């Protein structure tokens, strides 16, 4: 029983093309070349799903260091004071507080200094 | 480099170019008007105008030289008989060039070259 595969091939090609839509040059026009992009795009997405956590941690650490140095204390000393005071707040909320409300960050820093000293 | 040199080549050798100029000058002076490409008329001025300059004067040797140039007994007869007196009072500028667009065959600059005459 001869079976024609044109419909299935076209469906798969359209799926790949719609996945690859938005790329530059032939990467969004040629299926043979667009297929490589979608696999590479998936690999990049898989890597970035992990890289994003560490990059946001980097950004939050930088923001906390900036705020602490502006207030008159180093990031390491501030974190040590928080740990000695038994504060479980994380870098994300710490950075949000530092960015928006300065008085709250001043309270955090002074409590950390009191715990340290 | 062609610094100050004069004389177009027209994609032709010396013999072909001189024959072309001779024939074109003969036809131009025979018919009082011809149609030719603008470079051809520009290079043909320097040939035709001295013919009229020479024809201004009349003598046996002048007639012989005017025949040797343009190699046409009828043309030389027309010269010294009608081309002389009709321009005896004109010093230079015996020819006029009017651009008339481009040839359809190959899009070449076309222009009509004619004497300053024909005010009948």
């Amino acid at each position: 029983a001869r079976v024609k595969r044109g419909v299935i091939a076209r469906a798969r090609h359209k799926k790949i093309l719609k996945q690859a839509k938005g790329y530059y040059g032939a990467r969004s026009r040629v299926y043979r070349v667009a297929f490589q992009a979608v696999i590479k795009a998936g690999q990049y997405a898989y890597r970035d799903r992990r890289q994003r956590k560490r990059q946001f941690r980097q950004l939050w650490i930088a923001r906390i260091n900036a705020a602490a140095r502006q207030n008159g204390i180093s990031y390491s000393k501030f974190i040590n004071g928080l740990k000695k005071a038994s504060v479980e707040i994380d870098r994300k909320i710490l950075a949000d507080i530092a960015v928006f409300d300065k008085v709250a960050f001043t309270a955090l820093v002074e409590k950390a200094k009191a715990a340290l000293a | 480099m062609r610094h100050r040199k004069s004389g177009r080549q027209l994609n032709r050798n010396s013999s072909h170019r001189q024959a072309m100029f001779r024939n074109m000058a003969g036809s131009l002076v025979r018919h009082e008007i011809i149609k030719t490409t603008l470079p051809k008329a520009k290079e043909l001025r320097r040939v035709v105008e001295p013919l009229i300059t020479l024809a201004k004067t009349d003598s046996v040797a002048n007639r012989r030289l005017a025949f040797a140039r343009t190699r046409d007994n009828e043309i030389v007869a027309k010269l010294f008989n009608e081309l002389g007196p009709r321009f005896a009072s004109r010093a230079g500028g015996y020819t006029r060039i009017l651009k008339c667009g481009f040839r359809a065959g190959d899009n070449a600059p076309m222009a009509y070259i004619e004497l300053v005459d024909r005010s009948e």
Partner: protein, 56 residues
């Protein structure tokens, strides 16, 4: 003496960008006949600088 890889339509269009022509934008109207003609050229009918030049 031959291409290692196929150039792209972007580069092709960039190269062809300079191939576009420029309009004359110099249509001159005859003083007498009031006809459009190329500057320093005789009109189609045979009128130049008002006076006739072709007599045909």
């Amino acid at each position: 003496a031959v291409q290692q890889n196929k150039p792209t339509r972007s580069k092709r269009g960039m190269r062809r960008s300079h191939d576009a022509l420029t309009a004359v934008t110099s249509l001159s109207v005859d003083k007498t006949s009031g006809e459009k003609h190329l500057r320093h050229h005789i009109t189609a009918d045979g009128y130049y600088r008002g006076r006739k030049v072709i007599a045909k």
